[PDB]
Design an enzyme around this catalytic site. Structure first.
Site, mmCIF file in Angstrom:
data_model
loop_
_atom_site.group_PDB
_atom_site.id
_atom_site.type_symbol
_atom_site.label_atom_id
_atom_site.label_comp_id
_atom_site.label_asym_id
_atom_site.label_seq_id
_atom_site.Cartn_x
_atom_site.Cartn_y
_atom_site.Cartn_z
ATOM 1 N N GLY E 68 49.554 -39.074 22.382
ATOM 2 C CA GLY E 68 48.578 -38.490 21.489
ATOM 3 C C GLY E 68 49.131 -38.481 20.112
ATOM 4 O O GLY E 68 49.691 -39.496 19.652
ATOM 5 N N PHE E 69 48.951 -37.370 19.411
ATOM 6 C CA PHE E 69 49.282 -37.302 17.979
ATOM 7 C C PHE E 69 50.806 -36.985 17.767
ATOM 8 O O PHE E 69 51.343 -35.976 18.294
ATOM 9 C CB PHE E 69 48.457 -36.193 17.400
#
Ligand code: HEC
Ligand code: HEC
Ligand code: HEC
Ligand code: HEC
Ligand SMILES: [Ca+2]
Ligand SMILES: [Ca+2]
Ligand code: NA
Ligand code: NA
Ligand code: NA
Ligand code: NA
Lengths: 376, 354, 129, 126, 376, 357
Positions: E68-69
């Site tokens: 993800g981030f």
């Protein structure tokens, strides 16, 4: 002459010198208008994607909307909202799938609805605008499902809920003509009219077969809902036009986008959105180039503009870039939008002269779909 | 001219003949030796001040008059935020409208009326000459003109360079005349990158010509009642100080509990702090902001009491968006901030820092 | 276009990486995704945290403190990316560090990075820079 | 370089190039470029059972083979060796020959995200 | 010189010719080994990201892992698992945040643990390898939190559970030395030793301040858990080395990577991962070039190699590309990996001669972080 | 030699003197005019066959012998997937192991023992001549030798071009002698892109030299009990046909309910379908597969009975990964598959196709 960044530098410099104050805040995008254009970036099948909201007149990005895996954008024609059907997973591209529809305010871009779609029913496919579609009153969104069989999902935007799946025949795409009616193209070479209620078997009627099994109709026909005109090129630039404005299908005379000598010399359409239709001008725009017959998804460097009634060629523009998709603004003196997936750049042309006017670059990874509202 | 007017205000400002029993002047509470605030120890310590009658205490801490002349006249700006005015609750429009109020306030100077003020003005030959030369003959015979002219003189006196000299270390450093210490510059850097600059800077962006470390707005920062001061005020343990909502004409419920962002100039020497003087130490005032940001047990506790801060006196309209910054000031940054705030002391009060 | 050369501030185009206020910007200039030089684009959330830098303005020859603030809650814009590091210090000096996602204080707890604004918050004045 | 509009020319000497003869109707990324092989999926991804076909000319033996492409699913797009060929590719209404569709059906765990495609032979052309 | 794709065309043609059948299936990655290298693409702050698992010997991508981030990857030095701390949101980049740890089987790439981290406690920052760290026994994962204050989160990979947050002072990075101990670098110029039992405040003791307030230490030190060697370049190529192998911090002689002359002609370290350390060779590698003092994050074109004990330069390589990050394998005759963010390409060099051997291109959008297991 | 052995098998194959009451030969149940399947009606229609006693019914449908010589001998590949063998449950290793079993099966030809079979062979002077020339003098006097020699003859006869001529339209089309009709071509394309090819093609990938439309593996497709056939067989209301697990030596409970994938060659002419003959029409056998894919209520209904297909006789070890393809066959695709499967009919049985179509 003076770029946007140059005009901005000059104005900030002048505020600084004047001691002008101002609160850092969240901008509103300018009111939607006819020269607004949306470019969606399926990002070559990435799990998350971007749509860019662009002022076509200034060639300026005025906003962006995030989306998930191969979302389907729609733009309400009257400009009151935009929406997409989208797909996310709990762990990026893996785990629990949630399909959902978001509706957004066109100025703040904030979601004003988030509607879950039961049982992950979206069709995952390279983006075809007419695989997800708004009814003309903007109240319903219809989305295609392929698996386990062709079906159409009905979503109530006004009440913000999923309604039902409709069983259809072996057909594809969704061209709504009424609050409760849409057309699909079938494997048999007909169109199917589907009329649906809240419950009960949809009434499904087929038109006559309007093309042989060996003429191939492209995945990106242009449809003007407000004209009820379906503009459907074949691989050879043969154009079928179907007039749905009566509520039933009327088959218009076929035109040829290319002359016989051009065809003999290997000119064919090609790209993604190969075709655009300007409703007020009743004009068709087709992306064409010299190409082998199975190179039908590659970019094209020319647009032919032809009168939809007579089939007469009005122009053949040399676009000057590798263009995969076209669309037009629906206002008069329209713009011709020419998006290059390779360049990730929207080129903004004068539709009358074919002149490139300006361009917006850096539009994602593989931007493919242009949408405009028909607000007139 | 604008000079004589101010020099008249200078005389009125230290004259106790403007109090009922002739026992207090504006300078009694706004002591020029204490950056125009009140040195005098009272029932609630230094939290609130005692009036002319020797017993009545106020319910609010006497604020500095330094830099008060930079505050714009009260108004609501185009985003609907109220700005400016005088008093902690903005209930006076400007310094002129403010000046007559302590004179007539029974809890302060306690003159019965404008007339009794005019009477005291006439008893002084030097006021006859000074007022008459500025506002014309017989001015003092007319209680209304006498009182308005006195307020005018006081306001002009407060607008002189004496109340706002901009000679703090901070001012000198902005002139490139000196540098901040490493600690001071850290404090400055913190003050402007952390939340504080959202409220304690004149502007949102760009550089102010005459920074006074307040945007002139009204914010409820969620302060408890000052127990002893509220007791001494006699206003009652039921009482709620509604801040800006108490200004006549403000009806908006969203303003309840909101107070004017004080100027931080001289803050190091005008303790105790907040509208009710509840915190005696500057360090405590800074620490109070951690109640909104920090997870740590210590953040919930006033270091002065060793007890929890207290429920807010007004539990709504907290400026949560600004106060819940997500970041906690550790000891080092609180130190840096004290160091930075001390640089906002006027040159003449530098000796008081000790 | 020589990335190692001393950075030469200009005051004539805010969308370019060499605009004087972008001297310690890390990410994307908001003005390229529907913001402006000092405002966030629609749909994003403006953080209250910032990292600061002293940026030389070639025009007035003065040094301004730029307190960068992030616009959060969208995937990175992809437009006009820029990384400059004038006066930039490592993470343990976070007030001057710019790898940090400065989205603190953003509405709705938005913490994803979209783009950065470059507002001026003061003159002055740093020891390191 | 290399004219995208030119007739496609198959080669049987490099499976990572978009003109490799089995890729004549591939859309996406060659699995061999992200840890799969010509006919296997990379670790972590799930192998679809659905497929689109094409008849691809093999210049090694002069024969045309049916290639039934199958997606490797449940991972973001690999982003290595992208390719799009459309030899014989028909529109979406002839889906057994249509290659914009994410042919991830049947993949384990209901994986439907597109990572890459493999190019196994399943028959001789006819 | 036959490429992997050519060798593969040949084996396929031969299977076809011999009529050899094989089952289409999911491959397993080759056993983790010393020449395995992981390249993480933080993707210039994109909401989803990719890790590339590469066989460094073959220059072949052998697997990938989605994240993800700004996730923090970790690799068990023994090769028995990989993991990351990652961050997703319920609508791409907006809505509810989940921080979590995944542990992956290193040959199937399947996740074997998925551990929620409560209250979104991860530090969101351009990727610093030492902002999340495995303890030497691989049973615990520690991650840094910045907000509301510096803290370290303790994740039990064995019971697959989050345990608790540790209060620390104003310090940064996490260098585990034991099942219950790690160091951090503090604002005041010291290192903090953090010793956590199962309960209460950890025991926190400081070293001597070891550098002035104006000597800037980079965000990407090299740290070898197995050697307890913390290698910390400052902005001028000055190198701090801290020995943590006894359980407490001993300071090694400070060493200079560029010559006093060279610094006078504008030589400075610059990039992302500016430094590598080879444990068996006791050897520091440093990305340097000629640059302005505040161009410290730009690519560099040269690597210098120096002996850790003395500071003797051993080689200076002309990388031939713009390199942002380096690292080395930890076996004999190590590879020197040189990742170009700009080229999205891992260049694989012989670390002895500095020659380019092979390279792996198309490593996402902005790959930055190279990790290797130290298995010997 | 190779001619003669097969010719001796041709002779035993049609010889009813190999059954107890002498009423039954291989050809009685494996009728060459019906692609070596049983045309005879019993208590369960054509589901199961009736033995030589005129009364006993088997529990499984009599399969074609066409193309059965292409099946590998039974083995476990390195997948751990069992492949090959004869009988629906793979319990014979190969053709030769299988051929003696009908002979002695009290439910089929019912000879008491090998000696009784040997005594029958000795009774015929052509067998004494034919057997002795291939296997040596006095072969018929050794019941073990006579029995094994008859099984060899019969395996060799099933290996001739007669049983596997590969002269179906499909073959002719794959030779370039003709083209498929457009329905057929579409059926072929569906077959090779849908899940059918995961089990009904020889190879996982590549091209088979002699395609017989089975991969010879064992799958439990979750078929119900055929009630009438199960009652006729007399095995009991509580009997479970375990499929491959009944082969002796197989102990793995994961093999329960798995049956050998049949060659689809001649499928059009050898109804009814499945191992227990449960479905009469070819279309129904195809429709059965939609039960794992379709969301429509009709997909769970057997169109021949209008009732649910039925609980699986063996509810575990179903081939779900293959069966649950996520895609439903619409009617156009089912007609396309019927047409395709009919191209799989040997030339000599094309005339039989009339009364299917
Ligand atoms: C103690 C008995 C006081 C005397 C005498 C005077 N003032 Fe005062 N002042 C006092 C208090 C308790 C407060 C705050 C009261 C409140 O309701 O908020 C004040 C406030 C002012 C202000 C406003 C400053 C600001 O808002 O920042 C001004 C301009 C002011 N006082 C001026 C002033 C003058 C001119 C006086 C003599 C006529 C005077 N004050 C007397 C306490 C006392
Ligand atoms: C707006 C939301 C504010 C933020 C963020 C900060 N401050 Fe503040 N401060 C504010 C108000 C409205 C008031 C008066 C509140 C009241 O009702 O009394 C204050 C007060 C101070 C004081 C007291 C000064 C005095 O003369 O009594 C100090 C020392 C102070 N504030 C400092 C400060 C610092 C250092 C901040 C960042 C940590 C900060 N404030 C944030 C408004 C707001
Ligand atoms: C009816 C009473 C039969 C007679 C006479 C013979 N066979 Fe048969 N055959 C019959 C059935 C019911 C079955 C399947 C039984 C099961 O348990 O699965 C069979 C099967 C075979 C096979 C296997 C074919 C395959 O698995 O695909 C072969 C090779 C076979 N039959 C040949 C055979 C021969 C050679 C016979 C005369 C000796 C013979 N059969 C008699 C039904 C009957
Ligand atoms: C493995 C999981 C299979 C898939 C996928 C398909 N089939 Fe199948 N088929 C399979 C088996 C194991 C069997 C015998 C089942 C039993 O226990 O009896 C079959 C049978 C058929 C038949 C009947 C043939 C006969 O009785 O001689 C037909 C007509 C058939 N199968 C066709 C078919 C089609 C068209 C498929 C794709 C829809 C298909 N099968 C998938 C194994 C498997
Ligand atoms: Ca005070
Ligand atoms: Ca049968
Ligand atoms: Na008190
Ligand atoms: Na009021
Ligand atoms: Na039956
Ligand atoms: Na058994």
């Amino acid at each position: 002459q003076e770029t946007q960044g140059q005009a901005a530098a000059r104005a900030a410099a002048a505020d600084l010198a004047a001691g002008q104050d101002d609160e850092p805040r969240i901008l509103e995008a300018p009111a939607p208008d006819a020269r607004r254009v949306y470019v969606n970036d399926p990002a070559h099948f990435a799990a998350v994607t971007q749509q860019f909201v662009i002022d076509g007149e200034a060639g300026r990005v005025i906003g962006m909307i995030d989306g998930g895996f191969l979302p389907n954008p729609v733009v309400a024609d009257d400009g009151s909202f935009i929406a997409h059907a989208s797909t996310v997973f709990s762990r990026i591209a893996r785990g629990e799938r949630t399909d959902y529809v978001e509706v957004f305010d066109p100025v703040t871009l904030l979601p004003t609805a988030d509607i879950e779609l039961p049982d992950a029913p979206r069709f995952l496919v390279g983006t075809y605008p007419w695989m997800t579609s708004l009814t003309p009153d903007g109240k319903t969104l219809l989305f295609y499902q392929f698996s386990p069989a062709p079906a159409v999902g009905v979503v109530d935007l006004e009440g913000k809920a999923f309604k039902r799946m409709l069983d259809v025949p072996d057909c594809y795409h969704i061209f709504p003509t009424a609050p409760d009616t849409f057309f699909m193209h079938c494997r048999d070479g007909s169109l199917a009219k589907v009329a649906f209620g809240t419950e009960g078997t949809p009434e499904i009627t087929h038109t006559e077969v309007f093309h042989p099994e060996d003429e191939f109709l492209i995945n990106h026909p242009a449809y003007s809902q407000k004209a009820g005109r379906l503009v459907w090129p074949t691989y050879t630039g043969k154009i079928h036009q179907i007039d749905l404005s009566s509520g039933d299908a009327k088959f218009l005379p076929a035109v040829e986008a290319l002359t016989e000598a051009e065809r003999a010399d290997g000119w064919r359409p090609g790209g993604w959105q190969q075709v655009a239709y300007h409703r007020a001008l009743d004009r068709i725009y087709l992306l064409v180039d010299q190409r082998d017959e199975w190179r039908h998804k590659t970019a094209s460097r020319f647009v032919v503009v032809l009168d939809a009634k007579t089939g007469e060629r009005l122009a053949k523009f040399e676009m000057g870039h590798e263009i995969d998709s076209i669309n037009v603004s629906q206002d008069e003196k329209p713009l011709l939008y020419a998006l290059s997936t390779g360049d990730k750049t929207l080129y903004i042309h004068d539709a009358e002269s074919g002149e490139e006017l300006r361009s917006v670059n850096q539009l994602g990874h593989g931007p493919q779909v242009i949408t405009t509202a028909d607000m007139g | 001219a604008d000079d004589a007017l101010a020099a008249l205000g200078a005389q009125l400002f230290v004259d106790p003949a403007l109090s009922r029993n002739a026992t207090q002047s504006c300078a009694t509470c706004h002591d020029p030796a204490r950056a125009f605030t009140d040195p005098r120890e009272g029932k609630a310590g230094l939290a609130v001040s005692v009036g002319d009658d020797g017993q009545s205490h106020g319910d609010r801490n006497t604020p500095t008059l330094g830099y008060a002349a930079l505050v714009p006249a009260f108004h609501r700006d185009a985003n609907g935020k109220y700005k400016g005015g005088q008093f902690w609750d903005g209930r006076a429009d400007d310094l002129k409208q403010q000046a007559g109020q302590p004179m007539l306030n029974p809890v302060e100077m306690a003159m019965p009326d404008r007339a009794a003020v005019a009477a005291r003005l006439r008893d002084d030959p030097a006021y006859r000459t000074g007022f008459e030369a500025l506002f014309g003959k017989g001015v003092l015979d007319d209680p209304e003109r006498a009182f308005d002219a006195a307020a005018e003189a006081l306001a002009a006196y407060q607008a002189t360079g004496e109340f706002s000299p901009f000679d703090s270390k901070y001012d000198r450093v902005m002139r490139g005349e000196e540098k901040f210490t490493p600690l001071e510059e850290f404090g400055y850097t913190v003050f402007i990158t952390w939340n504080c600059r959202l409220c304690h800077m004149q502007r949102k962006q760009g550089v102010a010509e005459r920074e006074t470390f307040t945007n002139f707005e009204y914010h409820n920062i969620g302060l408890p009642v000052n127990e002893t001061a509220r007791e001494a005020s006699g206003l009652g343990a039921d009482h709620v100080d509604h801040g800006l909502l108490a200004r006549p004409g403000i009806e908006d419920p969203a303003q309840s509990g909101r107070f004017k962002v004080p100027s931080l100039r001289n803050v190091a020497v005008t303790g105790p702090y907040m509208h009710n003087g509840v915190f005696t130490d500057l360090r405590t005032a800074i620490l109070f902001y951690n109640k909104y940001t920090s997870r740590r047990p210590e953040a919930k506790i006033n270091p002065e009491t060793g007890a929890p801060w207290g429920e807010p006196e007004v539990a709504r309209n907290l400026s949560l968006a600004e106060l819940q910054s997500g970041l906690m000031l550790d000891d080092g940054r609180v130190d840096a901030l004290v160091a930075f705030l001390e640089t906002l002391t006027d040159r003449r009060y530098e000796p008081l820092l000790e | 276009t020589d990335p190692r050369a001393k950075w030469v501030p200009q005051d004539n185009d805010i969308q370019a990486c060499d605009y004087w206020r972008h001297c310690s910007i890390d990410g994307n200039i908001c003005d390229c995704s529907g913001g402006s030089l000092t405002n966030c684009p629609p749909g994003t959330k403006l953080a209250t945290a910032s990292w600061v830098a002293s940026c030389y303005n070639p025009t007035d020859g003065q040094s301004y403190l730029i307190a960068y603030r992030d616009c959060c809650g969208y995937n990175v814009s992809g437009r006009c990316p820029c990384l400059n590091t004038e006066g930039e210090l490592p993470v343990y000096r976070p007030e001057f560090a710019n790898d940090i996602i400065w989205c603190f204080g953003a509405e709705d707890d938005a913490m994803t990075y979209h783009c950065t604004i470059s507002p001026i918050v003061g003159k002055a004045s740093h020891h390191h820079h």
